[PDB]
Amino acid sequence: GSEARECVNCGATATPLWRRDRTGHYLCNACGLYHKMNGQNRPLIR
Ligand SMILES: [Zn+2]
């Protein structure tokens, strides 16, 4: 699978708009919210 992009955080490949950061990643939307206010990386689980 992995058709569209894969959110480096949750793998969400159905986001409305991707966005890379200093690491050039591709979060889906809420996974970057932390880097926006907290600035740190997102924990998540895998
Ligand atoms: Zn995500």
Short mmCIF file of C-alpha atoms and ligand atoms in Angstrom, two decimals:
data_model
loop_
_atom_site.label_atom_id
_atom_site.label_comp_id
_atom_site.label_asym_id
_atom_site.label_seq_id
_atom_site.Cartn_x
_atom_site.Cartn_y
_atom_site.Cartn_z
CA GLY A 1 0.00 0.00 0.00
CA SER A 2 1.58 3.32 1.05
CA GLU A 3 -0.05 4.93 -2.02
CA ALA A 4 0.16 8.59 -0.96
CA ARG A 5 2.79 9.86 1.51
CA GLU A 6 3.20 8.20 4.93
CA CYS A 7 3.08 10.49 7.99
CA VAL A 8 6.48 9.88 9.61
CA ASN A 9 4.50 10.09 12.87
CA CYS A 10 1.34 7.99 12.41
CA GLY A 11 1.73 6.98 8.72
CA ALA A 12 -1.51 8.83 7.91
CA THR A 13 -1.45 8.80 4.09
CA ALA A 14 -4.92 10.36 3.74
CA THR A 15 -4.13 13.82 5.14
CA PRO A 16 -5.61 16.84 3.37
CA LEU A 17 -2.16 18.48 3.09
CA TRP A 18 1.34 17.19 3.92
CA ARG A 19 4.02 19.39 5.54
CA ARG A 20 7.72 18.65 6.15
CA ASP A 21 9.80 20.15 8.98
CA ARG A 22 13.53 20.61 9.69
CA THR A 23 13.78 16.85 9.10
CA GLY A 24 11.90 17.15 5.79
CA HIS A 25 9.35 14.62 7.10
CA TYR A 26 5.68 14.52 6.07
CA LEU A 27 3.38 14.73 9.12
CA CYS A 28 -0.37 14.47 8.37
CA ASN A 29 -1.71 17.33 10.53
CA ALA A 30 -2.10 16.81 14.31
CA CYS A 31 1.26 14.98 14.49
CA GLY A 32 3.05 18.32 13.93
CA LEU A 33 0.83 20.32 16.33
CA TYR A 34 3.38 19.49 19.06
CA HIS A 35 6.34 20.87 17.07
CA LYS A 36 4.20 24.00 16.54
CA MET A 37 3.71 24.90 20.22
CA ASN A 38 5.98 22.44 22.04
CA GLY A 39 8.62 22.42 19.28
CA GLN A 40 9.76 18.94 20.38
CA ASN A 41 9.00 15.70 18.50
CA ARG A 42 5.78 13.67 18.85
CA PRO A 43 5.77 10.53 20.99
CA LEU A 44 3.06 8.32 19.44
CA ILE A 45 3.34 4.52 19.64
CA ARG A 46 4.49 1.68 17.36
ZN ZN B 1 0.21 11.76 11.49
#
